[PDB]
Amino acid sequence: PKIHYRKDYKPSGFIINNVTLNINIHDNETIVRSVLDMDISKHNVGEDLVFDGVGLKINEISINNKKLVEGEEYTYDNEFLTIFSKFVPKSKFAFSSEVIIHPETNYALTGLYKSKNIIVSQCEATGFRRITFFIDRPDMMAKYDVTVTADKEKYPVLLSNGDKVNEFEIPGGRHGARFNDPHLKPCYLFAVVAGDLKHLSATYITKYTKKKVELYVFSEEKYVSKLQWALECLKKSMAFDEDYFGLEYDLSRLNLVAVSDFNVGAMENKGLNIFNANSLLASKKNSIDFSYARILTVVGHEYFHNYTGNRVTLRDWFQLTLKEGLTVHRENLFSEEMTKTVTTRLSHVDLLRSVQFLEDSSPLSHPIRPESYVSMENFYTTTVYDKGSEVMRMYLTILGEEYYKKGFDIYIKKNDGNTATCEDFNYAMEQAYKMKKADNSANLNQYLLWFSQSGTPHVSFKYNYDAEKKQYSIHVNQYTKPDENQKEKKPLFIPISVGLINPENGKEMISQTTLELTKESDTFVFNNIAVKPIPSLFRGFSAPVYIEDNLTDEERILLLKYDSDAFVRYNSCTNIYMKQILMNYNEFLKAKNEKLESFNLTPVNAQFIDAIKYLLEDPHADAGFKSYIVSLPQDRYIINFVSNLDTDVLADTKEYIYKQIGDKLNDVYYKMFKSLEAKADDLTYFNDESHVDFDQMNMRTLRNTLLSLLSKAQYPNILNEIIEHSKSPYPSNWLTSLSVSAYFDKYFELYDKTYKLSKDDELLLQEWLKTVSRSDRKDIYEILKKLENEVLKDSKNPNDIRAVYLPFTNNLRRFHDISGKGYKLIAEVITKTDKFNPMVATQLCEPFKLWNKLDTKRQELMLNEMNTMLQEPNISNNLKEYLLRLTNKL
């Protein structure tokens, strides 16, 4: 396998200044003519001119209008076009190619492809080379003049980046449109779209310069009624970047386009953002609640890339976190501001501490700036994105809002119109830091270890209180486990946002303060502390770490009740659950291993249950927050604390704990389920796709969480509630009805009822598939076969394949069936999918990431399947690299 190393970056010996494309779409072929206005750079040493170009059929190649011939002036091996150095000019030259590509057969959804009746591109990271020849790396920045031609009836809307400067008719029922994008860009930001698209539009006026910007959102005709919320979210995004960052949009027009077939969420192509339809389109009668926050976040993210990625781009792909971590942090500030609910930040944290922490203790562990790769596409990871966002967020915590905004403006301005590296960002932040500290010798050199050091730090605490002196100390230690990337791990710069709670009255005892831990250990002392406090640690989840609070459960319950910080209250609850889960898991495991005839289980703490009841009964407490407290920690979080995990024992553990709590609280749960109905299900705004009440949504979330707990419990006559719930106008509720009906004989009636409600909207049907896939059914494998035969069939749509299989892989009892049948099922899907879409096939490998955390029989079963997949003939490079790394061969 072919390996790139971060330290080996060098600038090209060539420059591409202008790109002039003609993309002529026909039924059975697309012809791409391209003129590159090129030159030799100051780094040239008379090397061969080598272009990336994958799967292209050459019609012609020339330099300065001299035809070049294969075997004489060039070679082409279907990956690289090499122009021998003797035929490479020494000054400004025109390189011309014409190639034929086939979007109609491109099922990998990279390069130029067909999605239903739309032709669309996806170029990040390495797709532009599947369109035409290029030096396809992000430091090759150029300006683009793009003409698209097509059949007018089929493809009446033609789009590429930038200003539309002409439109023209062509004989034989064709037409064309020409675009000029004035902004220098890397080729990964190139896009083109051709389709029978409908739109909604609005005009936005920029806050400071009063520039009129035309905003267009596009879909296929069937779904144009589903565009409004995205348009609204775009306006919101624009205003947020103006308001917080002082950043205005920089073209006369911005287009967003939904396509049905897309490998990931969306893409920030300049002036022409392209979305998975599932991340752009919604309506309140045909989408679940969660669609709304997803569209807000994805529109926002792609918008924020207009500065953090587009106006300031990447020197090389090792810098990916500089655009993705920073953009996710911007996205997260935006969504926290727009929703005004504490659950938004909690959701981010839950994502990190489950999936990213698992990744960071897996064989795939990498620093947010990797040192090497084979397919760049495998490093679009939750590490680079979500840990990167937390590292980008820590600057804000450290500097505070005012000095953070100063540093960010230093960065964005210095590096405008150019490439940048992670070091450029740290330098900007370090200038702000100097200013904030009033000290020109202060530096953030140690901060750079957040970019280079893999693994999750562990931060642990000890406390002491001197009652005579009224003086409190917090002794803090950090540790990172050695790994394949570093045999010796250095201490990080860890900001610890802290409060102190008086346990006798529940009140705050200090101004919140942010402790800067920079050594392996340190002791922070507080004076004028009138009584022994309970510390409120890592408020807001102030660094991406494992926290060992060394608190008793009684102290944790007091924080849950009385602290101000949602994260700390939620984490204190999480920690109580984790202590219980590990204890009960150990008890079940020992009983199983020793084949005991009888044994004991530690009961759930009764004062903790009382605290849950108190918070649920408090009408002034937050519904979203309540839904987090009645749910156990996710399985992927739990697994970070158990080695050789027996998944059946864990399933039994979780069931015990849920039943202990329900035995005490189910009447409370039922009473709340009923009492929340009127406000949860009020139809205010049901016809308004410009406004979402996120509090009301959290009330539905809470009802639906309670209904699941009551259903699993077989609470008396709950089936009557499930049936009434199925009649609700909200899809979040009627699809819940299907899920929770799993525990009753009514499931197949609700399966059919909901299928009929879902089948005529593509995205609703995919939400129905997810609902079925995740259902807690003993007969889930027969259900999956039913979905394969009746609904999924031969679909190559990644949303369909993901909907049918991923939820099922999170079924702890059934996916991990000790036969290995679950592993075998998903591995066959992965291998099948890899033959046409390697990126999606790698996505589908997610369940295997934890393989070396399982009990030794399940490890062996997973490993067996992974090595079977590795033996498949013509396995993609994407999948092969992934699986070699995951199985500790690479």
Ligand SMILES: CCc1cccc(CC)c1NC(=O)N[C@H](CC(C)C)C(=O)NO
């Ligand atoms: C933010 C969601 C996300 C997290 C981690 C990794 C991925 C890519 C597998 C994603 N989803 C995206 O939609 N990411 C795209 C990647 C583009 C190259 C297609 C992106 O960041 N859009 O801006």
Ligand SMILES: [Mg+2]
């Ligand atoms: Mg081809």
Ligand SMILES: [Mg+2]
């Ligand atoms: Mg379809």
Ligand SMILES: [Zn+2]
């Ligand atoms: Zn992004």
